[PDB]
């Protein structure tokens, strides 16, 4: 569900 590319620092 969450997009890993929304913020690459997470």
């Amino acid at each position: 569900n969450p997009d890993p590319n929304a913020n690459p620092n997470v």
Epitope: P2, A6, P8, N9
Partner: antibody, heavy 120, light 114 residues
């Protein structure tokens, strides 16, 4: 663990601006630097990020055509260039290490902000 | 576009009283496989950049005083200041890093009643 942005500028409608973000105090190539803008009265507004290591970028849909983020690994610096400047573009432009949440480390650092005014 | 909505827009309380800020995300911020909420809270004093207070919905960042706590899950989230001190005057933003584009709420201004 610091981010230092260039000074405030004024440009003519249609011109371009090139803000910079100098980083230090941490491994520069390990994390991505975002660009966020705070217009007067508006909520914070994400523009895009760049992976400091390999230079890959993602841009918000609102700024696809006019934004370009870059970086120079030697000087530890990221840049954000905005072209075709308009009245709405008067805002403070931040660079930030947004929520670096890794198993080893957890921090969040913002540049002090660069006020850009679009005016003749 | 996850729209972050905060309630109220302005909060005014006496020194030492409890203060609570509400954030409602338009879709769920929970990933059920790892049971984490992709939500943070920021503080912004005037003339300064935002300051990260809480991440993973409830995890406080080292350095932040204990009186700041976050809670909630899914689409409803609360930021509590258990005892408001004078320097807590500021605007408080929730922030979701669940979906692209990253988004912030509209901010909540906290004022002291004196």
């Amino acid at each position: 663990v610091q981010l230092v942005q260039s000074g405030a500028e004024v440009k003519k409608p249609g011109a371009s601006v090139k803000v910079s973000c100098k980083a230090s105090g941490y491994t520069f190539t390990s994390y991505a630097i975002h660009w966020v803008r705070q217009a007067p009265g508006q909520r914070l507004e994400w523009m895009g990020w760049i992976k400091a290591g390999n230079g890959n970028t993602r841009y918000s849909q609102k700024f696809q055509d006019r934004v370009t983020i870059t970086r120079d690994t030697s000087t530890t610096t990221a840049y954000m260039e905005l072209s075709s400047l308009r009245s709405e573009d008067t805002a403070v432009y931040y660079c930030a290490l947004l929520t670096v949440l890794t198993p080893d480390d957890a921090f969040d650092i913002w540049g002090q902000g660069t006020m850009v005014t679009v005016s003749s | 576009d996850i729209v972050m909505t905060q309630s109220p827009d302005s909060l005014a309380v006496s020194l030492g009283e409890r203060a609570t800020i509400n954030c409602k995300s338009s879709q769920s911020v929970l990933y059920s496989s790892n049971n984490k909420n992709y939500l943070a809270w920021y503080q912004q004093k005037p003339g300064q950049p935002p300051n990260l207070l809480i991440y993973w919905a409830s995890t406080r960042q080292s350095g932040v005083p204990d009186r700041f706590s976050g809670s909630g899950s899914g689409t409803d989230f609360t930021l509590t200041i258990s005892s408001l001190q004078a320097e807590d005057v500021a605007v408080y933003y929730c922030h979701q890093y669940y979906s692209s584009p990253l988004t912030f709420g509209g901010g909540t201004k906290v004022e002291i009643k004196r």
